[PDB]
Design a binder for this molecule. Structure first.
Ligand SMILES: Nc1ncnc2c1ncn2[C@@H]1O[C@H](COP(=O)(O)OP(=O)(O)O)[C@@H](O)[C@H]1O
Lengths: 427, 53
């Protein structure tokens, strides 16, 4: 519950209507109807997943809400669909090539819902009488509507001895493997032992004696390749990034078995999204790889964001729009974000204030909207926070003009920093 | 009696056989629910066959 509000916490989805009509202000967003409708339609395409290898480029001036609309789409997509957010400079690893990192990122945003039929027996253990030789045992499971006694085997008795199960424990035994899983207790333990005090759990299902076809959908991403590349996979799946596995017999074989599962009804493919923020940091080799990697059937939807116009492509000398080669730039379609006006700026500032739980006068809102239209929006939020803190220190109830104007001089913007920078501190 | 014989064409006997096969010093861990749905609690018992154990 203790998680602080970040720069994109004010947004909590992409405000859209039944007909995908964008709204002025909803779900923490304001203005920018065109790019928001583009986000809505690409999100509909993602949730459809019928087509693979689609790319979208979010372009615009800084502070136009590129990362904002990206996080909004991520939120609107909701759980059950992977959304791999990554920065352009994260692919540069000292233990795995750029192409390998891109393959990892692509396969990481693809999920397979594996269906598994289970048969679990549950109930209340009324009698767990076990005859230890130092071989024979019987279990008396009880439910709210029926009871049954089961003769326990040697291995089952040993498993029960492993996980201590006293009378009155709510357990869920899997008839397939016999794994002992304790859920709780139905009553106290004799009220006499001067220890082991806990709370009592609710009774089990009436038909819990034998659940026939308990369906559990195990969801896992296509990053499962780490499970095969090495005999010990947890080390690679948890921390180790040195996963330069062999592409042959791993990628192709896993894809083939995933197709077999999809055809045989075991699992279903759920393509996610790969959001590369500041994609301009990718080397030209990474762009050349994305050009081809984006053509596979397992290719997720590649959302990218650029904050530049004509700029040199990293790893070469010639320039291209958005710092992306002409090929990949032409392949994808671009979503331009128009700057926000004064009203939109004021509304965004008000939404941020509401998020931060801070209140300020109308004149404060006006002067702060002015300052934000002049300097920037993020700087306006910084001033919101600073003025709220100055007001709290001042013992006031709401932020007045005298606090925003004070924190404006206390904290400087880059435009004024460079102005006072004429002291030639260093070069 | 004839009908009983013809229809006889027991698990308790197999349990008694298992008991026979037991060397004799068998300790049994036994816990049952006992009263203080109705209020109740769990009680634990550990039966020792012979004094050796
Ligand atoms: N539509 C918007 N609604 C609310 N805040 C926005 C919006 N657009 C930009 N911002 C704010 O501007 C700052 C930077 O803009 P951002 O959302 O990152 O877009 P960009 O990626 O173009 O900078 C962030 O602090 C963000 O909160």
């Amino acid at each position: 519950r203790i998680e602080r509000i970040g720069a994109h916490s004010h947004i909590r989805g992409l405000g859209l209507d039944d007909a995908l009509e964008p709204r002025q202000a909803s779900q923490g967003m304001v203005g920018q109807l065109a790019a928001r409708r583009a986000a809505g339609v690409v999100l509909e395409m993602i949730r459809e997943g019928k087509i693979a290898g689609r790319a979208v480029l979010i372009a615009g001036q800084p502070g136009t809400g590129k990362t904002a609309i990206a996080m909004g789409m991520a939120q609107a997509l909701g759980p059950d669909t992977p959304f791999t957010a990554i920065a352009g400079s994260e692919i540069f690893s000292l233990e795995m090539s750029k192409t390998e990192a891109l393959t990892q990122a692509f396969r990481r945003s693809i999920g397979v819902r594996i269906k598994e039929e289970t048969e679990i027996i549950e109930g209340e253990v009324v009698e767990i009488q076990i005859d230890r030789p130092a071989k024979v045992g019987k279990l008396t499971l009880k439910t709210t509507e029926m009871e049954t006694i089961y003769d326990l085997g040697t291995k089952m008795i040993e498993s029960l001895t492993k996980d201590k199960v006293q009378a009155g424990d709510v357990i869920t035994i899997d008839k397939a493997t016999g794994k002992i899983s304790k859920l709780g207790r139905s009553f106290t333990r004799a009220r006499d032992y001067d220890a082991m005090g806990s709370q009592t759990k609710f009774v089990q299902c009436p038909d819990g004696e034998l659940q026939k076809r308990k369906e559990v959908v195990h969801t896992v991403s296509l990053h499962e390749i780490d499970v095969i590349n090495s005999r010990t996979q947890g080390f690679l799946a948890l921390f180790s990034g040195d996963t330069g596995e062999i592409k042959s017999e791993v990628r192709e074989q896993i894809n083939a078995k995933v197709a077999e599962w999809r055809e045989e009804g075991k699992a279903e493919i759920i393509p996610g999204v790969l959001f590369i923020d500041e994609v301009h940091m990718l080397d030209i080799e990474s762009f050349s790889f994305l050009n081809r990697a984006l053509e596979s059937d397992m290719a997720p939807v590649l959302i990218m964001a650029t904050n530049r116009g004509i700029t040199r492509i990293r790893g070469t000398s010639y320039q291209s729009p958005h710092g992306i080669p002409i090929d990949l730039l032409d392949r994808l379609l671009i979503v331009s974000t128009t700057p926000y006006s004064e009203k939109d700026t004021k509304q965004i500032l008000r939404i941020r204030c509401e998020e931060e739980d801070v209140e300020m006068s109308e004149d404060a809102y006006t002067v702060l909207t002015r300052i934000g239209l002049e300097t920037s929006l993020r700087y306006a939020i910084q001033l919101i926070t600073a003025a709220s803190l100055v007001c709290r220190k001042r013992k006031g109830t709401e932020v007045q003009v005298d606090d925003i104007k004070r924190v404006y001089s206390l904290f400087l913007d880059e435009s004024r920093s460079t102005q006072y920078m004429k002291e030639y501190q260093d070069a | 009696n004839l009908r009983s014989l013809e229809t006889y064409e027991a698990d308790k006997k197999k349990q008694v056989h298992k008991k026979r096969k037991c060397p004799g010093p068998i300790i049994t861990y036994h816990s049952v629910t006992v009263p203080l749905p109705p209020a109740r609690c769990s009680r634990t018992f550990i039966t020792f066959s012979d004094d050796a154990t």
